[PDB]
Every structure is written in C-alpha cells, then in structure tokens.
Structure 1
C-alpha cells in the first residue's frame, strides 16, 4: 500500500499523470487540483501524497509541515563522475529577459513597463524580482510598479493579470496552471517573445530551450537568441550567453515535497519510477517519459535529468537556504509565521 498519489496541477498535468499511472500499473495514481496551493492542501489533508514544486511554493508547503524529498537535477559540467541521483544540485539562474530591439530598457527603467511572470509566489518569476523591486523602491506597492503584467495567481481584474490571455477559448485568464497561455517559464517567455510584455522573469535555461530551433512550437520556432538581452542588476544589458554574470539570483532547484510521515515511501517509489521512466529509463522513450511533455514542463521541468537525493535530510529552510527564506519572509510582509491554510 505504497501506492503514491501524485497531485497534478490543472488538466494537462492530470492527463500526463493519468498516462504515468496507467504505465506504472497504478503504483502511482493521480489527484488533481486547479492550483499549486490547492494541491498542497490535498497533501496536507492526506488526499494526495506528493508533487514537485518551485522553491517559492516549497516555502508555502514547508510552513505547513511538508518536507523536501528529492530535487530535480539537470545536466552539469563538473562533478561528472557522480551518478545523477547522487550529484549535488547546482541551482538555476533567475534572469530578467528583454528584446534587443527594445533599446535603453534596463533594470533601472523598468517602472511602468509591461511584465511577464511565471506565477505569483514562484522564485524567478516573482519572489526574486518583486523582492528586489520592493527593496529598491522602498515601497510595498509592487502591484503599481509595472503598468500591466501577466502574473498568474493575482486578482484577474487587476493590472497584474491584464496581460494574461487564458486558454484558447479565452477562459481561465490568469489562473496559475498551464491552461493560461502565459503561465510558467515557457508562458512568461512566450509573453515576451510575442511582445505582450517588455520584460519576462524566468530562468537562464528557458531562453536557451525556446530559441535557435531548440523548440519547434509555433510561437518559438523562429526565435533567435541574438534578439534577446538579459538585464543586469548594475544597469547594463548583456547577451544571453552571459547569464553567469548577469542574473538576479541563483534559485534552489524545484523539488518533490510530501508529508513527513510519507516521505520515505514517496522517495523509494520515485526512485523506482525514474529507473523505469526517467532519462535513460527502461521504458523511456519506449512507453512513457516522466521528464518529457513537449516543452510544457508538466509535473517536472522537461530539462530534468533525474530526481536526486538530498544531502543532510534537510528541512525546507535548509533546502531553500536561509537567505532565500528571509527574502521571502520580507516580501510577504507587503501583503506571523503560521501555515497559510
């Protein structure tokens, strides 16, 4: 009765989870909710066991008692002797991306421009840039900084949702799941690509993976890396090959979380499921690939090489790092340490 009930966020994740469930012979089954917060609630009620989360959502789950279990680990350079499951994670770079042709937009002229964010509460798309912005402006009024935005999860009538597009029928505008056209890393970068916004807060890998033919999706297939610049905190603009010297932060990798009392079982089941369906898996590309979903980053980021063991049985605070947790705490003061639910 180590069936693990995964929580899928929206219908496209639910469809992938259903295929995973079928292929796993119901070793894994699926609960679904409309939002990441709602999935965390199902886990707190014991109606789902686990899901994989961005760091800002790990902060929410962690305040309510849930614990990190395994982390996404993507390709690396050095440390290459180690098996992926054992290799330390390296964090990803949160960046602010603009079009080269939008000349003289820099970090210091962002006020009153249009912004694209992966979702409220997420690390690169929200906590890092809005925390930096609140700090730099000396003001908690971050909902009045950009003239319009798409920030999935904000009030859909507010200017923080004015750029969001909803689903193809145009329903579900601004919902924080993949139905919203501009949701997530891929959606916020598409929001910039399509010039709906002036700036997208995403990570370094997003720009690479959706330019120069790395994506064949209709909106991405013609994008050229050279037509984008990163915004540096010192006011300069750099090419996207320079993200090691022009990022807003290094983010902790997305990780699986669960109730502490289920962490051990969730871990062993996931280790076995990735041996089947993960990057070199017995049954991938054969039957099912757990870490593919045609660039849509459903359940896991498509660039995940494996889910890796954590060193030191970390608490969510240790996993996130004290400085990130403190930055989050500070930003949340704009809108005392109990579970949000």
Structure 2
C-alpha cells in the first residue's frame, strides 16, 4: 500500500536492494530482472513500482507512459544556498576519454579504433557519441565504425561485444548489467584503463572518481589523471580539467521513473527513505547508505547528494529537452511512434 517495489537490475543491485528492503522494515521491497528493459516491463505490468534510469531509458519508458518522479542531484557550487531537494539539476558532461600515451588519437581519427561504452541505449555511452558519428559519416552502419567494442546489450557474437569480458567465470558476456565486467560508467572506464579499448564514452565525473587515489579498487589504484585526455569535437585534445570546454554534450540527470498512476505515492516514500538513508540521513553512515556501493553505482550513482523534486511537473520530453529527444529520434531511425513493448 504505502509499500514500494523497487526493480533491481542484475544480482548485485538485488543484493543492495534486499539490504535496503530490510532496513526500511519492508516499506520498500524488491523485484529483480536481468536488463533495464525487463524492469521497465515489470513496472508497466504493475509487478514493480520504480527504478532510477539514465536519460536514454527514460526515453524508452516515456513512450510507454512512465513518468519522471525525482531526479539525481549531485553537489554544485551554484544554488548552494538552496536545499538539495529543491535545487535545480545541472546535468552531467558526456565526454570521450583516451590515454595520453595514445598520441595523435583525436575525434577525427576514431574510425577502426577500439571503443568502450556504458551500454547500448545509454546517454553518454551510446546515444550522444553514436548519434554524433552517424551524423558525421552520413551512414547508419555504426556497427562497422569501430574495429571492436564492448557495448553491453548488443549481439554477443557481434564486434560490438568482442571486447566485453563477462563475469568472474566468463559467463554473461555483454549483458547490460553489472555482471559484465565493462558495464556502466565504471566498467567502460576500466575497459580503457586496462587498454582493452582506445576510447571510452563516459561522463566527466567518472574520470575524477577513479583516478588519483579516489577509488582504491585494484585496477584504479595507480590511475593518474594526467595520463588521460578528453577528445573535443574540434579535433583537439585537452586535459580532463577542461571538460566544460571539451565535452560531447551535457546530459539530463538520471531520474526515478514510475507509472504515472503510482507517481505521487512513489515520490512520498522516496523522500522519507532518503531522509533516513540519504547523505546526512538519520541512519546512513550508521546502518545503511542508499547512495553508497563502493564506486559501483548500484541503484543510484554513488555521487548523488539527494533525489530532487522536479518542478514544472515535466513530461518526459520536457525533462529530457527538445535537443536530446531529437537526437535520440534521429539515431533510433537507423535501428514509427509507439511503446517498444
């Protein structure tokens, strides 16, 4: 009733969800699925209520009638006066990252190189870079641009999955969930940090969070920021300190979605859950922290300060913006208005 069913994607989000379920005294329970698309289907069936999504899936969900409820809000130096829950969202920077030692690699010489993407259909990892590449080449053959890639969610037998590693045992190669070693923001950056790929399409925050001792994870321990470079659209290469002038786009924040008819209820519960397990929540450091999972971004990104109210009660189109929606529509015509399920 005043109980919310959260949809976890894959085994590790299920485990985190179970812990949250427990700490909340079953005010939140869990449903699990193998992909984000399957979780979207559970919400449409009404077998789950909500999940936090990247812009690209918000577009998929919105076509099926799901609505944005609350958005991830990370720290800012502006609007700082305002409380986090009421502060507008800023969006994140979609960037292309390479190793400095890979000299002479620029945006213009990416053809036939190796790439690392968060997952097919995601904003920074797929939609922005591939929409840009389709536009620039006048061709929908994006499956042929890079020699090899790790792009979770593509055909395991295709070259877009050739660089993906699967789990500890080699199983689940290219699945779009955290079982795949190179999945998500962190996995895609690891793919580049390990020299599996020549380039990684992540967001600006990911580089900072997994370099200069910020991570402590074995593959990221010795990663230094000066050993990386951002690729700008003008054919240039800049330090990772210069993302405000060298990004592929600014992305709408990840946001919680639910069926429109369940939105008010999901919103109410979430604001209380975060009062309890949020950044300075009553129980977070001590019993459980919703926005922590050791650099793994499970359920929510680890850099989330809070989930923010939206204001202007936006539809999913208003939320994503006409810029981003037209870019997705244009790219999606390579792979006609309806819910994809």
With the shorter chain as reference, the TM-score category is over 0.9
The superposition leaves residues 145-183 of structure 1 with CA deviations (integer Å, 9 ceiling, x where unpaired) of 000000000000000000000001010000000000000
Unaligned runs of 5+ in 2: none
Instruction: Give the Cα–Cα distance (whole angstroms) in 1 for the partners of residues 45 and 78 of structure 2.
Output: 41
Deviation at 1:240, TM superposition (A): 0.1
The offset of 1:243, in angstroms, is 0.2
Count residues with an aligned counterpart: 341
Specify the alignment match of 1:86 in structure 2. Answer: 86
Deviations 1:35-56 (A, max 9, x none): 0000000000000000000000
Aligned mates of 1:160, 1:337 — CA distance in 2: 27
User: Any idea what the Cα deviations from partners look like across 1:121-147, whole Å, max 9, x if unmatched?
Assistant: 000000000000000000000000000
Q: In structure 2, how many angstroms separate the alpha carbons of the residues matched to 1:45 and 1:295? A: 32
Number of the residue aligned with 1:105: 105
Give the TM-score normalised by structure 2: 1.00
Q: CA offsets, 1:209-257, max 9 Å, x none?
A: 0000000000001000000000000000000000000000000000000
**How big is the shift at 1:337?**
1.5
Which residue of structure 1 aligns with residue 249 of structure 2?
249
Q: 1:2 Cα deviation (Å)?
A: 1.2
Any gaps of 5 or more consecutive residues in structure 1?
none
What is the CA distance between 1:196 and its match in structure 2?
0.1
Shift of 1:311: 1.4
The 1-side partners of 2:264 and 2:311 are apart by 15
TM alignment of 1:202-241, pairs within 5 A: 202-241=202-241
Q: Give distance in 1, aligned partners of 2:259 and 2:2.
A: 14
State the shift of 1:110 in Å: 0.2
Counterpart secondary structure, 2:139: coil
- Secondary structure of the residue that 1:328 maps to in structure 2? helix
Deviations 1:71-108 (A, max 9, x none): 00000011111000000000000000000000000000
Q: Distance in 1 between matches of 2:221 and 2:272?
A: 35
Cα distance, 1:272 vs. partner?
Answer: 0.1
Deviation at 1:323, TM superposition (A): 1.2
Determine helix, strand or coil for the equivalent of 1:317: helix
In the alignment, the residues of structure 2 paired with residue 276 and residue 232 of structure 1 have an alpha-carbon distance, to the nearest angstrom, of: 41
Offset, 1:279: 0.4
Q: Deviations over 1:298-323 (max 9, x none)?
A: 00000000000001110000000011
Give me the TM-score of the superposition, normalised by structure 1. Answer: 1.00
How far apart are 1:280 and its partner, in Å? 0.4
- SS of equivalent to 1:245: coil
SS at the partner of 1:330?
A: helix
Distance 2:190 2:179 in 1: 14
